[PDB]
From Swiss-Prot:
Signal sequence annotation: none
Superkingdom of origin organism: Eukaryota
Chain ranges of the Helicase ATP-binding domain: 47-212
Purpose: Component of the NuA4 histone acetyltransferase complex which is involved in transcriptional activation of select genes principally by acetylation of nucleosomal histones H4 and H2A. This modification may both alter nucleosome - DNA interactions and promote interaction of the modified histones with other proteins which positively regulate transcription. May be required for transcriptional activation of E2F1 and MYC target genes during cellular proliferation.
The organism's taxonomic lineage, starting at the top: Eukaryota, Metazoa, Chordata, Craniata, Vertebrata
Motif placement: DEAH box-like: 163-166
Similarity-based family: Belongs to the SNF2/RAD54 helicase family. SWR1 subfamily.
Protein name as annotated: E1A-binding protein p400
Region annotated Interactions with RUVBL1 and RUVBL2, chain positions: 1-305
Tissue/organ expression: Ubiquitously expressed.
Quaternary organization: Component of the NuA4 histone acetyltransferase complex which contains the catalytic subunit KAT5/TIP60 and the subunits EP400, TRRAP/PAF400, BRD8/SMAP, EPC1, DMAP1/DNMAP1, RUVBL1/TIP49, RUVBL2, ING3, actin, ACTL6A/BAF53A, MORF4L1/MRG15, MORF4L2/MRGX, MRGBP, YEATS4/GAS41, VPS72/YL1 and MEAF6. May also participate in the formation of NuA4 related complexes which lack the KAT5/TIP60 catalytic subunit, but which include the SWI/SNF related protein SRCAP. The NuA4 complex interacts with MYC and the adenovirus E1A protein. EP400 interacts with TRRAP, RUVBL1 and RUVBL2.
Localization terms from the record: Nucleus
Source organism of the structure: Homo sapiens (Human)
Binding of ATP, residues: D60, E61, A62, G63, L64, G65, K66, T67
Length: 305
């Protein structure tokens, strides 16, 4: 455990290395887009993780333009590794059109197959699966994807991406077990909410961090956490924090992204009109208003406000 932590600390740049590139790999000329310093550092870290076949999770906050990062990663893989696909993206039915239009604008040459339709259409698509290059990027709904779970499990997916999963209520343990059953060299997991103090969720994250544990899940080694083992549990929590520290590092729109927009919320004082002033004085000079002020009844003064 010491060796892995030391290697992770050595890999992560510290200090002045976040302004000057320590790796001589220049950006591709064909790539269209501007990369900031933290973006370049994250791209280098992800490339090193993929090249070394070491698992890692990017815990960056949502809304930072994941599409740009995904496009850059696919471009880097295609230029060097030639990994054109297949790649699995799971989104709700309301989001298919967004990614479809984005892919059509960015790359009309790539065929996009949505595996949704009638039974006869599904049969025709199944007959078309034998044709090579029938589909390269696949987007499908949750229900239809889980309907053909046995068929889809045969293909090893290079990367797993899930978005807006917590919003679905009725998540059975079988679906989570099937998700864990999928084997991928690179695993990505996104959390759009603060970490809850829930045993089940943290246990699932801890199991996802370290794959291939020989201990069965059902065989609980220590239950009924009495007062005797409080020090041991505190030590275990410290060890888990030490394990999770190097792979997780929050980056914000205000602290790290120092290419800041010059935001300011201006306040304009406006002089009231004479009609407005007359109505204002009439409402204040109303004896009911003074009675509400003196009595302090909440609804009266609130309605006056």
């Amino acid at each position: 455990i010491a060796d892995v932590t030391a290697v992770a600390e050595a890999i992560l740049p510290k200090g002045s290395a976040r302004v000057t590139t320590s790796v001589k790999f220049n950006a591709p000329s064909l790539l269209y887009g501007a990369l900031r310093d933290y973006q370049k550092i994250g791209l280098d870290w992800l490339a090193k993780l993929y090249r070394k076949n070491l698992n890692g999770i990017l815990a960056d906050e949502a809304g930072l333009g994941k599409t740009v990062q995904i496009i850059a990663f696919f471009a880097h893989l295609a230029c060097n590794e030639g990994n054109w696909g297949p790649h699995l993206v799971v989104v709700r039915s309301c989001n298919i059109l967004k990614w479809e239009l984005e892919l059509k604008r960015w790359c009309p040459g790539l065929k996009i197959l949505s595996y949704i339709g009638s039974h006869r259409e599904l049969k025709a698509k199944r007959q078309e699966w034998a044709e090579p290059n029938s589909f390269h990027v696949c987007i499908t709904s949750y229900t239809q994807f889980f309907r053909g779970l046995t068929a889809f499990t045969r293909v090893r997916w290079k990367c797993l991406v899930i978005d807006e999963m917590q919003r679905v209520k009725g998540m059975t343990e079988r679906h989570w077990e099937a998700v864990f059953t999928l084997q991928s060299q690179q695993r990505l997991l996104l959390i759009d909410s603060p970490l809850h103090n829930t045993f089940l969720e943290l246990w699932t994250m801890v199991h996802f961090l370290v794959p291939g544990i020989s201990r069965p899940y059902l065989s609980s080694p220590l239950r009924a956490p009495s007062e005797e083992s409080q020090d041991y549990y505190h030590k275990v929590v410290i060890r888990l924090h030490r394990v999770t520290q190097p792979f997780i590092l929050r980056r914000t729109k205000r602290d790290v992204e120092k290419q800041l927009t010059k935001k300011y919320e201006h306040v304009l004082k406006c002089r009231l009109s004479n009609r407005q002033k007359a109505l204002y004085e009439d409402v204040i000079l109303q004896p009911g208003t003074q009675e509400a002020l003196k009595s302090g009844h909440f609804v009266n003064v609130l309605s006056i406000l």
